[PDB]
């Protein structure tokens, strides 16, 4: 997690998916972006990338979270989904 930043996506409709595949790693805690769905909301923004850690969604702590909790926070959110990311180094 060598860089921490926020990326805010804007759902065009109430039920719009962000197009982020969230997976957990078996070697460390946290929720991570495995891949971005081609042409999806997050992929069109381009700010997000694979191997990013989702630290929080709309201020809701996902440090020791699960991809199901992340999905529930996005479902409960309005049109703005504010992701707080921790991108590793190189």
């Amino acid at each position: 997690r060598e860089e921490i930043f926020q990326v805010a996506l804007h759902k065009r409709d109430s039920g719009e998916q962000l197009g982020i595949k969230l997976v957990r790693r078996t070697d460390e805690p946290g929720v991570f972006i495995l891949d971005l769905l081609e042409g999806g909301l997050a992929a069109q923004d381009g700010r997000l990338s694979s191997n990013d850690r989702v630290l929080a969604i709309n201020g809701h702590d996902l440090k020791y979270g699960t991809p199901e909790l992340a999905a529930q926070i996005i479902q409960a959110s309005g049109e703005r989904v504010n992701l707080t990311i921790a991108r590793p180094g190189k």
């Binding site: 982020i20 595949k21 969230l22 957990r24 999905a71 996005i74």
Partner: peptide
Amino acid sequence: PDLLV
């Protein structure tokens, strides 16, 4: 365990 959000 592994969702598309």
